[PDB]
Amino acid sequence: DKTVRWCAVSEHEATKCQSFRDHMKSVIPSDGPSVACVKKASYLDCIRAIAANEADAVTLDAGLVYDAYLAPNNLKPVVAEFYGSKEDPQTFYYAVAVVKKDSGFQMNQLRGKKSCHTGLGRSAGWNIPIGLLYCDLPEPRKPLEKAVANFFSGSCAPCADGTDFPQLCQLCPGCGCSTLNQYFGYSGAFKCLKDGAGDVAFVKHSTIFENLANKADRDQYELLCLDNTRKPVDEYKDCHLAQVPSHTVVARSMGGKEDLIWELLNQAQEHFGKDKSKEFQLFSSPHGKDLLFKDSAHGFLKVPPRMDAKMYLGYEYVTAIRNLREGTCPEAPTDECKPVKWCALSHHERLKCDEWSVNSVGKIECVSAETTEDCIAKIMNGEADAMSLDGGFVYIAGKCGLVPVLAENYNKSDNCEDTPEAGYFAIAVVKKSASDLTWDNLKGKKSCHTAVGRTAGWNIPMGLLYNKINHCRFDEFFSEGCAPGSKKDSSLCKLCMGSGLNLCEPNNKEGYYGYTGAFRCLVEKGDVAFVKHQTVPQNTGGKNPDPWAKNLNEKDYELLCLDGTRKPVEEYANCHLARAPNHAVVTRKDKEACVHKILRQQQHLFGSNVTDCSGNFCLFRSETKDLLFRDDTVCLAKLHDRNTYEKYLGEEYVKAVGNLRKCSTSSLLEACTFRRP
Ligand SMILES: [Ti+4]
């Protein structure tokens, strides 16, 4: 009925929901977002209600968001509350482990150390840390309080049972569950570390900032990272035990009215949001506290539609809560790397992966997903481990927290596994004839692109020029040009040749298609052409027999540079738009070492050493084309220092694809950006 049935868990919430209803009726048009109220006994009954189509939306803490996700409910986050500004929303907080500088231990070696918890049963203080360390605990892990007591050599766990397990109160005897215990809560847990009682304090990111105003004092503290490294306390976003959403509205995954819910809550915060009206305070509780929404909430934000619970909570939070609830660890905790789960994007990719798996003798396993973004999501949540990606998807995967580990090398050499190729150089070519041309005044000139959606011919150049575009109409920057794959009637199709049906088409039929074609576009009808550094040489000195390219001199053309200067073709290395990276294998950081190791083995067994791809299995050969890896892949090379998407792609490339993604939307990128801007 275009009506949103909100579920309340108390009589107080029901009343507020009724006020919310009546008021929203007075300000919203006859045909607009309406609200009905449904009262149930608890949050769980509300989750079941929504799943049963008896309600539509409820706001939940992280733990209950996970509950709502499980079957048969299958709810998902749709709207989130934020507690800061539009620039600093603070939708999430980060559970971190604070420690003294140079204490001499990491996450993987916390046994025998002393711990300070905010309180037993709390998220950052207990559930999350203990969830992650669950398998590192001694058996029997049940009851849990006992297992933790044995793991640490003394600690402070407020509200714990000191009578049966006194070791948990060693740092705060009695385990006082009130502020009377100086080591209770966030302030207390931090003080437990500060006074030297404990070695580590499991708290929020903001905790140390609340208990120490001088940065000089904070410098003696640092955080434990899950990759068993330490970092400064203000780098918690890169070093945290988990990332937690504070308050999130959930609805059905299918037919949950997520758009309608957003419409409702959006107009709601508009009229009755924070300090918006005196008639009704959406984020104020007249009777109770934190009714329907947290009272500290400043407003709402739409959760990107690609998001699901697993992705929203993060692999850390899910790992922890699963460990506590399921309580399953490998009975044979062998230090050998588990099979690498490769992700296949197609039927043929899967068939090749299946052959690879059999030959690997269990070292490789296979998982299928519908699209590239689905595979990335699977690597994020753990349903898969590794996959090969091009530059654009390495960028998206990087924004999603994954890291590159191995690059595909395409050049034949004696030792390619130790010489990662940075790829060719994308450059902008213009004739020496027009001396007025410069990277700045390209606006209104004639351009030649290999094709739309191309690294050197389009994405890099048009991405860097985006600041000059100021919008998403890229055919309006250049007066005319040839960019195969455009709308045909576009200005970027005006200079194209080809035939009627093959006009402005991305294929051989178009004569101005490709690097050579864009060069043809340049020499015949055009001012600038975007290609790679080997294009001009290969098409000059008589090296190209075609008539138009029959007799051209390399010295007749020059490269545009970013700062505005010009140089000859020979100096492409110092004058270029950006470097076009090779494909690279990406994975989750915790799986980097294993993926890096096992692939090397597989590479040596089935790489470019085999001759009979018939009698053996060739990893870099495809029954069709470029399955899992590019067929012209010589070998996979270790990346050394370039083990992040920023370091691997380069500043100009990430700048280009980043700007360009503002116009071309990616559902996955939206989601990952939401969790980490
Ligand atoms: Ti290319």
Side-chain angles (χ1 to χ4, degrees), residues 1 3-85 87-100 102-141 143-277 279-288 290-445 447-467 469-486 489-493 495-508 510-519 521-524 526-549 551-554 556-599 601-637 639-677:
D1 298 336
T3 312
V4 180
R5 304 167 293 177
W6 205 276
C7 190
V9 303
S10 70
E11 280 170 8
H12 288 344
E13 282 197 357
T15 309
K16 181 173 178 177
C17 177
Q18 286 166 348
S19 298
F20 179 59
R21 171 187 63 193
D22 293 328
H23 283 156
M24 198 67 30
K25 293 291 180 184
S26 68
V27 187
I28 296 295
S30 300
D31 185 27
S34 46
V35 181
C37 300
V38 180
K39 186 249 184 297
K40 300 293 181 177
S42 59
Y43 284 120
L44 295 178
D45 283 315
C46 270
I47 290 170
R48 287 187 269 275
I50 293 171
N53 201 32
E54 301 187 346
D56 296 319
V58 165
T59 323
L60 304 170
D61 290 330
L64 283 162
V65 167
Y66 181 82
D67 284 321
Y69 147 76
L70 304 168
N73 311 310
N74 291 118
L75 309 191
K76 62 168 183 172
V78 293
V79 180
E81 295 177 9
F82 70 90
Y83 307 82
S85 60
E87 188 68 6
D88 181 22
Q90 304 190 256
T91 303
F92 309 88
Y93 69 84
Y94 302 84
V96 302
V98 188
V99 289
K100 286 287 183 61
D102 303 332
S103 304
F105 63 89
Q106 301 288 348
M107 268 297 303
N108 64 333
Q109 52 197 4
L110 277 168
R111 189 186 317 276
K113 280 57 176 176
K114 304 181 184 304
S115 61
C116 304
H117 309 267
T118 67
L120 177 135
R122 289 156 100 111
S123 292
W126 182 264
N127 292 327
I128 287 165
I130 303 299
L132 295 172
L133 293 166
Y134 185 88
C135 286
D136 297 349
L137 305 183
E139 319 184 20
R141 280 132 183 171
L144 188 60
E145 303 189 14
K146 186 182 174 184
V148 177
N150 289 21
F151 182 78
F152 296 116
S153 70
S155 46
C156 170
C159 319
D161 180 21
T163 303
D164 298 334
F165 322 109
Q167 222 171 336
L168 297 175
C169 313
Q170 176 179 134
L171 279 53
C172 52
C175 283
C177 197
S178 60
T179 58
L180 286 173
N181 184 9
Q182 57 167 356
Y183 293 164
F184 166 88
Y186 288 108
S187 305
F190 175 68
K191 185 171 181 292
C192 171
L193 171 68
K194 177 175 171 181
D195 295 344
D199 303 319
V200 53
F202 302 108
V203 295
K204 275 190 186 185
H205 63 282
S206 63
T207 303
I208 190 167
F209 292 95
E210 290 166 0
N211 287 81
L212 290 175
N214 298 333
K215 192 269 191 181
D217 285 279
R218 295 187 228 112
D219 288 332
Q220 293 69 354
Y221 304 95
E222 45 188 19
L223 307 176
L224 299 176
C225 312
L226 292 183
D227 58 325
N228 300 322
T229 200
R230 300 193 173 192
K231 289 195 176 67
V233 299
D234 55 336
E235 297 186 25
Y236 53 82
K237 292 195 176 85
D238 299 310
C239 182
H240 59 259
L241 273 54
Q243 169 171 356
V244 189
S246 287
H247 222 40
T248 305
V249 176
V250 300
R252 287 182 295 280
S253 296
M254 293 288 293
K257 311 181 187 172
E258 53 267 19
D259 288 334
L260 188 65
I261 291 163
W262 172 240
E263 187 180 357
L264 168 65
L265 298 176
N266 193 33
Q267 300 203 42
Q269 61 174 343
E270 177 181 351
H271 299 293
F272 308 106
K274 190 173 190 302
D275 309 334
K276 281 284 201 167
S277 182
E279 280 283 312
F280 188 49
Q281 296 79 238
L282 187 70
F283 301 116
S284 195
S285 300
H287 301 280
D290 298 327
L291 291 173
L292 298 183
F293 313 98
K294 273 176 160 65
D295 293 330
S296 49
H298 287 175
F300 299 120
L301 294 174
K302 178 161 177 170
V303 182
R306 179 59 181 81
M307 199 83 74
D308 73 314
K310 293 187 69 177
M311 180 180 292
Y312 201 58
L313 299 169
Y315 83 98
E316 302 103 316
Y317 192 92
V318 173
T319 297
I321 192 165
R322 280 190 67 179
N323 285 344
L324 296 187
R325 296 191 179 183
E326 294 168 25
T328 72
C329 299
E331 187 178 341
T334 69
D335 289 343
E336 291 178 21
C337 285
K338 294 178 180 179
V340 176
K341 300 188 191 66
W342 205 270
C343 194
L345 295 174
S346 69
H347 194 46
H348 287 291
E349 272 209 349
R350 181 56 189 262
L351 295 176
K352 170 167 174 175
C353 187
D354 284 347
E355 190 175 354
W356 184 15
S357 171
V358 171
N359 283 269
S360 71
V361 195
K363 283 292 190 171
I364 295 290
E365 285 174 2
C366 301
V367 185
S368 292
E370 187 176 21
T371 65
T372 299
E373 296 192 348
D374 292 339
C375 276
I376 296 174
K378 272 181 145 57
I379 294 179
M380 291 164 61
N381 64 15
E383 296 179 2
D385 299 327
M387 174 178 57
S388 187
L389 295 172
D390 58 18
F393 283 119
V394 160
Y395 168 78
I396 292 179
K399 294 285 282 170
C400 291
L402 304 186
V403 295
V405 178
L406 292 164
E408 298 185 353
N409 272 9
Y410 307 132
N411 295 336
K412 308 170 188 175
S413 57
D414 293 323
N415 50 332
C416 61
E417 306 188 12
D418 306 316
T419 65
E421 307 170 11
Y424 62 82
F425 297 91
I427 44 84
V429 184
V430 295
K431 315 194 195 107
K432 287 187 184 171
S433 306
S435 62
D436 57 322
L437 286 177
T438 295
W439 182 248
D440 306 321
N441 67 304
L442 260 62
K443 187 167 186 175
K445 306 301 185 180
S447 69
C448 300
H449 309 270
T450 62
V452 301
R454 292 270 268 167
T455 302
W458 186 261
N459 292 343
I460 291 173
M462 303 304 288
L464 293 173
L465 294 169
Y466 175 82
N467 62 79
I469 311 292
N470 293 322
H471 57 299
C472 288
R473 307 182 192 188
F474 294 94
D475 50 31
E476 285 180 18
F477 183 86
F478 296 116
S479 64
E480 291 184 335
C482 182
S486 303
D489 63 334
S490 175
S491 169
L492 302 168
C493 288
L495 271 48
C496 294
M497 34 171 291
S499 297
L501 287 190
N502 289 337
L503 176 62
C504 201
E505 279 292 309
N507 55 63
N508 286 273
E510 176 63 40
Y512 292 170
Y513 168 102
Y515 295 96
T516 59
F519 187 58
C521 171
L522 170 60
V523 304
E524 282 182 6
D527 298 323
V528 64
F530 303 105
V531 290
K532 63 177 77 178
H533 65 278
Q534 317 92 298
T535 303
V536 173
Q538 287 178 333
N539 292 27
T540 58
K543 301 172 195 155
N544 190 12
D546 294 35
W548 60 273
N551 41 17
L552 281 301
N553 293 21
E554 177 180 323
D556 289 356
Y557 310 94
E558 288 179 322
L559 305 177
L560 299 177
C561 307
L562 293 167
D563 60 48
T565 192
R566 288 160 67 107
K567 298 186 163 60
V569 173
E570 301 177 335
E571 304 183 28
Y572 60 97
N574 288 109
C575 179
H576 61 249
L577 309 171
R579 218 155 177 173
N582 301 347
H583 293 194
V585 180
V586 302
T587 186
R588 215 169 60 181
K589 185 67 180 179
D590 59 311
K591 306 243 186 61
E592 175 169 22
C594 278
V595 169
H596 196 166
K597 174 178 160 67
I598 295 193
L599 259 58
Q601 293 173 2
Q602 297 299 314
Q603 189 176 204
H604 296 119
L605 298 176
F606 315 106
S608 61
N609 68 63
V610 295
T611 61
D612 53 339
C613 294
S614 53
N616 297 325
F617 171 80
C618 291
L619 181 61
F620 305 144
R621 295 287 172 81
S622 306
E623 181 175 335
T624 57
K625 180 179 175 51
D626 297 331
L627 302 179
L628 310 184
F629 305 91
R630 267 171 58 174
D631 290 327
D632 54 329
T633 299
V634 178
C635 79
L636 305 173
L639 291 194
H640 309 296
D641 192 2
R642 319 169 51 194
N643 67 315
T644 62
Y645 81 96
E646 300 130 309
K647 294 176 189 177
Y648 180 81
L649 296 177
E651 307 191 311
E652 290 76 7
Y653 189 88
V654 299
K655 183 182 287 182
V657 303
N659 291 288
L660 215 63
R661 275 294 179 190
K662 298 190 176 186
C663 296
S664 295
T665 301
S666 170
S667 315
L668 180 62
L669 181 56
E670 282 188 10
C672 296
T673 295
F674 187 92
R675 299 183 70 262
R676 177 188 255 273

